[PDB]
Symmetry: C3
Subunit: 255 residues, 3 copies
C-alpha cells in the first residue's frame, strides 16, 4: 500500500510522482523521508505500469537541508553501526528513469537528492547548495562526488568549502541541471518530460540509463565496450523490432 | 583513392574527409564506417599530413544511421560481426582530428563528431541521440562521450528523451570547441587544421595522447603519464628548436 | 624561511603566497616550485592557518614555466630530476588553497592555478596551454586538469592550438570558481579565504579530500569513501559544536 507520513505519491499513466510533504520543516530530509522515498521509488520501479518517476517538493523548497536534530548527538559508533545515509543508495539502484523537479531550496541532502536523479528540471527559483561545512561536517549523501563530477572542481570546491548557493541560471550552464523552466511551469514541464520518457520502450530506456551511468564507473575504453554489448543485446528484444518497424511505418510504437 | 561514400582532399599538411551521401543526408552505414576509417588511417600514416578534418554538407554533417542495417539484425549477427566496433579505428588515429560540423549531427553523426579531438560547429549545428525512440540505445559511444562532455543531467535528458541541442547550448555545455557562422565553417576549420598541422608532429601526437589519458585512468595516473611524455619530448629536435625560437624571439622552424 | 622568488604573509588564519619574479612575469622555475611547495607545506602544518592563497602580480599570475631553464635540458636531466614532480607536494597540502588569478595564467601558470582548490579570476585573466609550439606539451598536469575541467573538445582546442581563453569563457566552461573585477581580486580572495579559514579546520580538510576523490576512482568508490569520512566527522568536537550552534541559532565556536 502507498500511504506515507512524510511524502505523497500519485500514479498517473506510466508516470509516478513522489512529492516531499514536510511543510513545517521546508521539506528537510530526515531518516523517515529517506526510508519512505526509497520505499516508494523501489515499489514504482518494480511496478511494470510505471516508466518514469518524478521526485519533487513544494514551490518554496525541493528540500531545504536535513533534520540536524537527528544528527546532532549521533556518535561515530551509531554512524558506523547504522551506516547512516547508506539507504539512499537504494534510490540509485532504481532501474526506471527518475526526474528531479526542483523548485526553491535544494540544500545539503536536498541538493544531493536532486543529483541522484537521472534528469534534473529546475524552476528559475531553484537554489542549490551544500552548506554542511558550516555545521562542522561535509556532504554525506554523495555531494562531494556528484557535484564535482557535474560542475568541475573549481565550482564544487567553492560551494562545498564556502557553502555559497548557486541559482538556477548558474546551475544550468555549469552542468548541474538538464533545463530551467519558469516556476509556475515546473510541475507541468516535469510531467511532460516524464511522459515522453515513460512512453519510451521500458527496456531500451533502462539500458540507456544504465549505459550513461557507466560513464562514471570505469575508463572510457570499458564504457565503450559495455555500451556496445548492451546495444547488441537490445536487438534480442521485441521492443527494438517494434520500434524500428514503427519508424519505417511512420507511426507510434506499441510496446 | 576512389571512395563510394566519401571524398578525400589533401591541402599542404591537412587532409579532409568529406561525407558524400547527399541522397541520404550523410547518414552513416557500414560502408561509410569502413571508408572513413580506411581513409583516416591512410592519412594518419602519411608523414606529410599533420591534421585531419572530417566534415559533411551544409545541411547535415551526418543526419543519423541507416535504419535498413539495423531493422532485421539479431543479437547473434551483431555479436559475431561486433557491429560498430570498426569505428574504434578512428580513435586509434594518432594525428589530431577536427570535426567540422554543420546542421544535422544526429545519432551516429553526433557520435562521429564526439570521436574527433577538436569540434568546430557551424551556428546551424544540431546535436542529438534519438536511438531511444527506435527502441535501442547509442551504439557508437554516445552514452560515454556525451556524458563526459556535458554532465549527467543533460546527457540523461538528451539520451532518454531524444531532444536536440543547438550549437550555442553545445558550446556552453562542453560538447564543442568553438561556434562559427555557417558560411565560415570550412574556412575556420582549415585555419585551425593549418595551425595544428604546422606544429611539431610528434609534440601534437603526444599532446593529443596525453589529453586522451584523462578519460582512461585516475588523475594520479594521468599526471604521471603526462610528465613521462613531457620528459620524452626532450629527446626530440623539435623541443630544442621550439624553445630556442622563444628565447631568440623568432618563429620556430619545425622539421 | 627567507625566499628569493616568493612573498609569504600570514593574517589571522589566512596565509598568502605571492609569486615574485616580476622581471619574468612570474615564470615558474625550479626555485619557484621548491619555494611555493615549501611555503605551502609550512603553512599546511601550522594549526593557526586555515586557508592558503596563491597569487601573482596584477599583470601575471604566471606566464608559463621558465623556458630558459628547460632549453638547458636533455632527456637525462629531465628523467633523472623527474622534472616538475615536486609540484605534487602542493597537491599533498591538506588545507584548502585558493588561486587568485590576475592577467596571464599560461602553461605552468594555468597548471598551477588548476592545482588549487578554489580558483578566483579577475575579469582581466587570460588562460592558456601554449606548450605545443615550443615543441612540447603540458608537463604540470594541464592535459589532465584542463580536460577534466572544461571537457575534451575545448581542452584539445586549447592544447593543440595554444589559443587563449578569457576569464568569462573559463567561468562558463568549468575552469574558474568566480570572476571578479581586477581591482577587487585580492579583496575578494581574502574574503573567500577568511570564510574558509573560519570553518572547522577538520571539516574543511575532510570536505576538500572528499572532493578530490571524485577524480581518483569510480563513483561507487567515491560515494563510499565520502560516507565513511562523514561518519568519522561525528567523532570530532567541531561536528558537535557546529550542529549545536545551528539548533541554538547562534554562532559556532570551533576549537
Ligand atoms: C609545465 C608546463 O606545462 C611547461 C611550461 O608551462 S611551457 C611555458 C610556455 N610559455 C609560453 O609560451 C608563453 C611565455 N610568455 C609569453 O609568451 C609572453 O611573455 C606573454 C604573451 C605572456 C606576454 O609578453 P609581453 O607582455 O610582451 O612581455 P615579455 O617581454 O614577453 O616578458 C617579459 C620578460 O619575462 C620573460 N618571460 C615571459 N614568460 C617566460 C617563461 N614562460 N619562461 C622564462 N622567461 C619568460 C621574457 O623573456 C622577458 O624577459 P627577457 O626579454 O629579458 O628574456
Amino acid at each position: 500500500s502507498m500511504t506515507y507520513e512524510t511524502i505523497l505519491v500519485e500514479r498517473d499513466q506510466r508516470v509516478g510522482i513522489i512529492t516531499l510533504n514536510r511543510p513545517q520543516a521546508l521539506n528537510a530530509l530526515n531518516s523517515q523521508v529517506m526510508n519512505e522515498v526509497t520505499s516508494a521509488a523501489t515499489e514504482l520501479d518494480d511496478d511494470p505500469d510505471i516508466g518514469a518517476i518524478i521526485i519533487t517538493g513544494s514551490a518554496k523548497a525541493f528540500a531545504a537541508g536535513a533534520d540536524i536534530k537527528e544528527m546532532a548527538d549521533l556518535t561515530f559508533a551509531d554512524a558506523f553501526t547504522a551506516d547512516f545515509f547508506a539507504t539512499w543508495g537504494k534510490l540509485a539502484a532504481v532501474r526506471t528513469p527518475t526526474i528531479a523537479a526542483v523548485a526553491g531550496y535544494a540544500l545539503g541532502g536536498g541538493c544531493e537528492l536532486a543529483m541522484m536523479c537521472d534528469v534534473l528540471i529546475a524552476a528559475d527559483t531553484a537554489k542549490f547548495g551544500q552548506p554542511e561545512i558550516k555545521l562542522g561536517v561535509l556532504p554525506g549523501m554523495g555531494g562531494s562526488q556528484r557535484l564535482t563530477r557535474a560542475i568541475g572542481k573549481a565550482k564544487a570546491m567553492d560551494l562545498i568549502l564556502t557553502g555559497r548557493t548557486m541559482d538556477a541560471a548558474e546551475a544550468e550552464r555549469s552542468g548541474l541541471v538538464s533545463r530551467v523552466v519558469p516556476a509556475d511551469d515546473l510541475l507541468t514541464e516535469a510531467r511532460a518530460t516524464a511522459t515522453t520518457i515513460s512512453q519510451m520502450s521500458a527496456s531500451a530506456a533502462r539500458m540507456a540509463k544504465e549505459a550513461v551511468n557507466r560513464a562514471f564507473e570505469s575508463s572510457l575504453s570499458e564504457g565503450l565496450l559495455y555500451e556496445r554489448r548492451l546495444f547488441h543485446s537490445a536487438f534480442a528484444t521485441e521492443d527494438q523490432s517494434e520500434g524500428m518497424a514503427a519508424f519505417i511505418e511512420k507511426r507510434a510504437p506499441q510496446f
